[PDB]
Amino acid sequence: MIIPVRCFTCGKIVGNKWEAYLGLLQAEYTEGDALDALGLKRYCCRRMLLAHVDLIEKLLNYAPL
Amino acid sequence: RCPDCGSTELVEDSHYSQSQLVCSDCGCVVTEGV
Amino acid sequence: LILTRLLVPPLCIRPSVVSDLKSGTNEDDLTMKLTEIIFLNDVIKKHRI
Amino acid sequence: QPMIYICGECHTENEIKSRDPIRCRECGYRIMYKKRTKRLVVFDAR
């Protein structure tokens, strides 16, 4: 649904690096170089950000509003 | 009324899927089982 | 060996459910069979008369 | 006592009393949700 704040394995703060990651996707950066520039050395945070699906906007499209 | 203390505080309170009309003062089980 | 009287069992063997949600009750098959047997006896008596 | 509800498409606060046909003004939708309560609720972060 939404990006988790904490990483499951280590616990590094990763929720604040989601939208900026999207910006790196709006830019010309690929996945690997963007994850490297974000400061994710260990592969657990890379899996957390890469394998995450942004379903919050799809649900808000069905929100009452 | 309760058969022991004579009170009229008979409440239907089910205890873990057991329908039970019991006195609320002394806990005397008036009726149980459905 | 030849039966002339039928022993209708107690209500403990024939449980009846009072379904207050509708205008009907739930009865077992034995009650309906006994009802049909009584109806047949009455019809036989009516035809004999 | 004013009982308030929310429509399914207009999402407007509608006040209807007991034994009323469930409807909503300026539309015809017939799905009427109840508003969230005002009582305090305590949650555990666990």
Binding site: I3, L35, R46, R47, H52 | - | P9 | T37
Partner: protein
């Protein structure tokens, strides 16, 4: 010099999915039913009239189904969305109307729009509101754009009509009997009657058996009755082989024993063996020979048509059948039932067509009866059907047939059950796989073990691995990823082309030509089309004409050299698969065609029209040569496989690297993925179902198959990727168990949400009284609502946002007891639950019957604990054995601690190398920021992921140096770390935990109830009693089965041996011999039932000493 290979060939698969594929089957079938078949059914019964008062008629002109609407408004329709039908617990149907003309008083009166019923509209169909809509318009209608659709919505529930599988009709089947006799059977089925006639060799001679004959009669007598009287012609028709004559000799001798030599004598003999259908109404007037001739012409072999009492075709058919029986009586070439080339698949379209035909015939019969009863005696007021056309008949019939699922067609004498099933909303994969299910005609009740096998005929058509593990193993199957079901054709141009291709008429020549080695019989849907020579030219010309487009691409042609029969199949329900045509060791599809397809110059229909890809049937592919790959193409190759991974189904597609695993592992993985927990759709929040499981933070898999991209599973994942380390830790993962990390679960890993529905109805009865909800019963002592009515709002309905505890009321419902002042008794909706629940939403709706429907959506947020079942996308189902802290978990040099620790011992016995390959590919992908593919019979190789690992500085085998977290010392062996896509299952320990106190008992037998929702206790079965007997524990068995279950104290009279009451015997009218006795209550019930059966048990009591 390797053969060139088209790399983009797989691009043919998505284009095929654009017009056909997974869900398009039922949609197209329902569209064909509601657009073409219904008009044909109406035309077949366009005119209905009564015998009394002639010149009166009711003529149907044209029937329409229209758009779905709701009858809520007073005599006014209104467009309604499927989600609204789900919420209001109503049906999603459209009004079936028809324009008619009739005669009231001999004056023609016409109606242009008169509704007659309501047809439930399949979702995403032609008339469904969801078709032709954009995802934004889907959001406006509160419907998920990724929803497969194709299911009906009745009374708020989603029903799916499974694809039925049955044997093909009008086909000769040679099979052995119980005694080993190799006989034949033919189930000739026309649009009116289905008759299975058999032929046996029980005594060296052939007898023909039918349900309309009292005793089976020799086949030679039937031959003589059907026009051919010379025995030489019969023998020529049977065959000219010496062994054929030697086998048929006894039949000729038995025929010559009797005096049957002419057609009249044989017809009289047959009529003597005919029994009346229980005194058929009407004067017979010497119909014996006539009845025999009618049974021979119409009842026997219905599919073989006689022009005008000319049994030449029927004679040739039965002669070919006798020849097949004779040939099978030698070499045991017995045909098998499990061969799917003789199987037919009925979709929802054909079933709905039959049901609508039956309902329309019943409606017409009812109208004719009403006319006959009303018109001749009522009054000068002329009777009109409009005042009697009940519109609820067809509607109620359709609703009941779709909802209950049992179909009873008396016109066809078909009594089926389990046709419709509740759509499983466990996950998107669950519904997507259930939509493409196929049930067997065997209708499992016994251990057949003959259709349950995996036949090689299921290649490319049905998924081999996807099957429900349990009693339904092998009889419930799933369609493949790339498959299609054919429809019915006109069969006209087929006959024309066959006649123009040199097929000689069977009536022009005798049966002797049937015995020639070079003469091949050509059939058509079980009917003898004729004979031919040099069948290779015929088959090649027919295939070339089908490729050209003059013949429908779904018409199949096959050749059987053993029986020398050319079968031409054009009926619907046959399975076909697209294949690339190969001509002279080179496929017709080139790289340029794939480039044009990718750029959009052409589509799959262009490949079909340009003789590049063609559909092959099972019978047709039996004779064709298919190559799996380009390098496998040899000189004798006719077709090329599009993609091998299309062999697997939808559920099997989720398996990463399935060819590296064992088949039971794949089956268990499919079964668990059908139960995988995850998101359902984009409208899962507004959706209110009786049970829903959602994942807090779902993540798409790192190793995704191309099937996942095709089915868009990555948009709706049903699992999470966790850093799993394969090692043994603390001995809490002995057998299939796994160890979870406490810090991981604390940070949201595996967090799940369970949504339950609580529905209540306030209906108006016959009397002018209604169910009303009382306010919260405030306590006068504290001026606040009581603990039970604490969560209720001012209107007596629980408000969302608060927490509900056990035995708390959600709706303070009170209902009247009359149906003078009304007397209301309280029947509140209490919440039965071990844990607390939170109310998310409360929906209040009003039906046309003024009944208020209230639905509360309770939410529970659950954390993984001991007892929760977890899957690993490889059939390695496990239970959380221990939750260790983060510091107790081992750590690598980088400081990563594993979330899930799984036992390595599960690998050798199961050989799940695919799991290791998936782990390695996922590690490489999360290292280089890529998504590796675990496509079946392909995907990323081990060398590539090894190079990716060595490039990033990690080990090329996944094993990394790990230091033990407990002792702080390094481990002697390296640990296999990597991200694995683990999925949580709906099986929770909280829902499965059960404990039973004394509790309630059943009224009939005073024993605890059965189910947990009924708060029942466990059952000590027969085998438990056997074990207790073997142990010798008499007192424990007595306490369990008598004291603790159904103990009772009865009164038995020692004089007559009967049962008394309250220390008194009514039989003897005394109480001196009455004594108390302990007994199981079931034993007393048995004694009373036996006394009711005149089997009086007389108990002779005695002292215990």
């Amino acid at each position: 010099a390797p053969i060139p290979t088209v790399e983009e060939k797989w691009r043919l698969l998505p284009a095929f999915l654009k017009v056909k594929g997974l869900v398009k089957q039922h949609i197209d079938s329902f569209n064909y039913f509601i657009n073409v078949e219904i008009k044909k059914i109406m035309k077949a019964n366009e005119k209905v009239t009564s015998d009394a008062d002639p010149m009166w008629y009711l003529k149907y002109l044209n029937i329409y189904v229209g758009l779905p609407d709701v009858e809520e408004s007073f005599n006014v329709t209104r467009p309604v969305s499927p989600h609204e039908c789900r919420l209001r617990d109503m049906t999603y149907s459209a009004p079936i109307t028809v324009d008619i003309e009739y005669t009231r008083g001999s004056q023609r009166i016409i109606r242009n729009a008169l509704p007659i019923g309501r047809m439930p509209i399949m979702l995403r169909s032609s008339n469904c509101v969801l078709t032709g809509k954009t995802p934004a318009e889907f959001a406006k209608l509160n419907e998920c754009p990724l929803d497969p659709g194709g299911y009906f919505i009745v009374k708020g529930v989603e029903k799916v009509i499974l694809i039925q599988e049955q044997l093909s009709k009008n086909r000769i089947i040679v099979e052995a009997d119980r005694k080993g006799a190799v006989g034949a059977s033919v189930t000739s089925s026309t649009h009116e009657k289905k008759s299975r006639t058999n032929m046996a060799v029980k005594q060296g001679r052939f007898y023909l058996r039918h349900n309309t004959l009292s005793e089976d009669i020799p086949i030679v007598i039937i031959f003589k009755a059907m026009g051919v009287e010379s025995d030489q012609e019969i023998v020529q028709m049977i065959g000219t082989e010496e062994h054929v004559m030697a086998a048929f000799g006894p039949s000729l001798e038995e025929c010559q024993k009797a005096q049957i030599f002419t057609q009249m004598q044989a017809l009289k003999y047959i009529g003597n063996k005919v029994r009346r259908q229980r005194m058929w109404g009407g004067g017979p007037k010497k119909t014996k020979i006539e009845e025999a001739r009618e049974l021979l012409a119409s009842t026997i072999l219905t599919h073989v048509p006689v022009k005008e009492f000319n049994f030449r075709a029927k004679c040739i058919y039965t002669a070919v059948m006798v020849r097949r029986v004779i040939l099978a009586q030698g070499d045991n070439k017995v045909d098998d039932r499990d061969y799917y080339g003789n199987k037919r698949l009925e979709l929802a379209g054909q079933l709905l067509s039959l049901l609508f035909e039956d309902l329309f015939k019943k409606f017409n019969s009812e109208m004719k009866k009403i006319a006959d009863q009303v018109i001749p005696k009522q009054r000068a007021a002329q009777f009109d059907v409009v005042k009697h056309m009940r519109q609820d008949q067809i509607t109620n019939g359709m609703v009941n047939a779709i909802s209950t699922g049992n179909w009873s067609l008396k016109r066809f004498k078909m009594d089926r059950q389990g046709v419709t099933q509740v759509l499983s909303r466990l996950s998107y994969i669950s519904a997507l796989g259930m939509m493409t299910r196929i049930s067997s005609q065997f209708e499992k009740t016994r251990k057949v073990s003959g259709p349950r096998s995996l036949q090689p005929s299921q290649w490319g058509m049905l998924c081999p691995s996807d099957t429900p593990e349990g009693e339904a193993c092998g009889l419930v199957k799933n369609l493949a990823l790339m498959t299609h079901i054919t429809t019915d054709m006109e069969d006209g141009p087929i006959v024309k082309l066959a006649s123009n291709l040199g097929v000689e008429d069977v009536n022009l020549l005798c049966g002797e030509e049937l015995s020639y080695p070079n003469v091949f019989l050509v059939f058509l849907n079980g009917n003898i089309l004729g004979v031919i020579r040099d069948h290779k030219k015929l088959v090649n010309t027919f295939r070339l004409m089908r490729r050209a487009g003059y013949i429908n691409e779904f018409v199949s042609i096959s050749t059987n050299l053993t029986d020398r029969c050319v079968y031409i199949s054009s009926d619907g329900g046959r399975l076909c698969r697209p294949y690339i045509i190969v001509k002279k060791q080179k496929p017709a599809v080139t790289n340029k065609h794939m480039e044009e397809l990718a750029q959009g110059y052409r589509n799959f229909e262009d490949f079909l029209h340009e003789s590049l890809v063609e559909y092959l049937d099972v019978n047709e592919e039996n004779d064709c040569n298919i190559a799996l790959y380009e390098h496998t193409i040899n000189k004798d190759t006719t077709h090329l496989e599009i993609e091998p991974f299309t062999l697997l189904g939808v559920c099997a597609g989720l398996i990463p690297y399935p060819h590296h695993n064992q088949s039971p592992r794949n089956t268990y993985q499919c079964a668990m993925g059908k139960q995988a927990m995850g998101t359902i759709g984009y409208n899962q929040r507004n959706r209110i179902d009786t049970l829903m499981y959602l994942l807090a933070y779902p993540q798409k898999p790192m190793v995704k198959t191309k099937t996942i991209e095709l089915i868009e599973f990555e948009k709706l994942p049903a699992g999470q990727n966790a850093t799993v380390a394969v090692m043994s830790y603390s001995g809490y993962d002995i057998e299939d168990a796994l160890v979870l990390n406490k810090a991981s679960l604390d940070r949201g890993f595996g967090r799940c949400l369970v949504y339950k529905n609580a529905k209540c109805t306030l209906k108006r009865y016959t009397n002018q009284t209604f169910d009303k909800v009382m306010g919260p019963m405030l306590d006068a002592a504290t001026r606040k609502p009581i603990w039970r009515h604490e969560i209720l709002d001012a209107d007596g309905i629980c408000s969302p946002g608060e927490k509900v505890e056990n035995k708390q009321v959600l709706v303070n419902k009170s209902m009247p007891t009359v149906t003078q002042q009304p007397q209301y008794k309280d029947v509140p909706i209490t919440y039965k639950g071990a844990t607390d629940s939170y109310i998310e939403k409360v929906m209040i709706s009003s039906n046309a019957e003024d009944a208020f429907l209230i639905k509360m959506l309770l939410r529970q947020t659950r954390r993984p604990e001991i007892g929760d079942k977890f899957s690993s996308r490889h059939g390695q189902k496990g239970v959380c054995g221990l939750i260790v802290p983060q510091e107790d978990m081992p750590f690598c040099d980088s400081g990563i601690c594993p979330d899930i620790i799984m036992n390595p011992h599960g690998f050798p016995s199961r050989m799940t190398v695919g799991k290791l390959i998936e782990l390695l590919a996922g590690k490489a992908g999360v290292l280089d920021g890529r998504f590796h593919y675990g496509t079946a019979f392909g995907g990323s190789k081990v060398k590539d992921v090894c190079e990716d690992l060595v490039r990033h500085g990690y080990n090329y085998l996944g094993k990394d140096y790990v230091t033990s977290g407990i002792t702080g010392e390094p481990l002697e062996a390296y640990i296999y770390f990597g991200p694995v896509y683990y999925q949580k299952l709906k099986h929770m320990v909280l829902d499965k935990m059960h404990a039973r106190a004394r509790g309630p008992r059943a009224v009939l037998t005073r024993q605890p109830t059965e189910g947990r929702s009924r708060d029942g206790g466990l059952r000590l079965g027969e085998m438990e009693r056997d074990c207790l007997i073997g142990y010798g524990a008499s007192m424990l068995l007595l306490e369990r089965l008598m004291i603790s279950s159904d103990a009772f104290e009865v009164d038995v009279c020692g004089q007559c041996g009967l049962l008394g009451y309250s220390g008194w015997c009514h039989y003897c009218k005394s109480s001196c011999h009455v004594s108390s006795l302990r007994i199981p209550y079931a034993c007393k019930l048995l004694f009373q039932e036996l006394q009711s059966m005149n089997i009086i048990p007389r108990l002779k009591l005695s002292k215990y000493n």
